[PDB]
Each structure stands twice: as C-alpha cells, then as structure tokens.
Design an enzyme around this catalytic site. Structure first.
Site, PDB file in Angstrom:
ATOM      1  CB  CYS A  60      -0.910  -0.044   1.210  1.00  0.00           C
ATOM      2  SG  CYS A  60      -1.908   1.440   1.410  1.00  0.00           S
ATOM      3  CB  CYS A  80       0.588   1.752   4.248  1.00  0.00           C
ATOM      4  SG  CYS A  80      -1.125   1.240   4.359  1.00  0.00           S
TER       5      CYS A  80
END
Length: 119
Positions: free
Chosen positions: A39, A42
């Site tokens: 991600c 993230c």
C-alpha cells in the site's frame, strides 16, 4: 524528547491483550496503524506517524500491524476493511479511527484531532 519514535509491531491477538492491559494500568490510549507493505499510502505515512509518535512520547504508545503478515484473528480484532486504518484504543477497545488514502500530512492532522479528543 526524540525527533521520531518507531512504531512497535503487534505480534498476535495475545500481544494486543497485553498491550491493552498495559495501557489500562497507565490510563492511556494507544494508536494502532493497520497497514500493508504493498500500500503506497501506508508506506509514505510511516515517517510522518513516527514524528507524531515522538510528539506524544511517554503519553501514548504507537503500534503497527501488517495485515498480510499478522494472524487473521488479530486483524479481526481491528475490524479492518481499508488501509491505512489508524485506530485509537483506550479502556480495552477501539474508540475511533482514521482511514488514509490522502496525502500523509493531512492524514496526520486528522489523527492528531482524534488523539486530542481521547488523550
């Protein structure tokens, strides 16, 4: 005071239980960053969360959990559906959360607002 504090990984549901028992002893909340290594948001959020963790050094402990690495039972404790999900827990339960998927600075400002309500 440090400039950055590393988030502590949560190993499993039992570790989360111990973390929440420790937080209860101190009458403090904790933050959990539920993330994934694929991600992009993230990953870009990590350094900004570690600077925010330093701002709350000794007042709020920050943890992380990689949703593909940790046991499924631990992810179920969080009731996660999107990443990053930054949760504030206190008194043994999730009190509030912030979903990322925006610019990291703006996610941090929303997380800060959440922290200020519960700390």
């Amino acid at each position: 005071r440090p400039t950055s504090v590393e988030m502590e990984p949560i190993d499993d549901s039992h570790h989360l239980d111990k973390i929440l028992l420790q937080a209860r002893e101190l009458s403090q909340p904790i933050i959990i960053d539920w993330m994934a290594s694929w991600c992009r948001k993230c990953i870009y959020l990590k350094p900004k969360l570690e600077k925010l963790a330093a701002e709350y050094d000794t007042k709020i402990k920050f943890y992380c959990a990689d949703v593909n690495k940790v046991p499924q039972a631990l992810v179920k404790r969080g009731n996660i559906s999107k990443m990053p999900t930054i949760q504030l827990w206190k008194d043994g339960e999730m009190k509030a959360e912030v979903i990322g998927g925006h610019k990291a600075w703006l996610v941090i400002e929303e997380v800060r607002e959440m922290i200020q309500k519960f700390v």
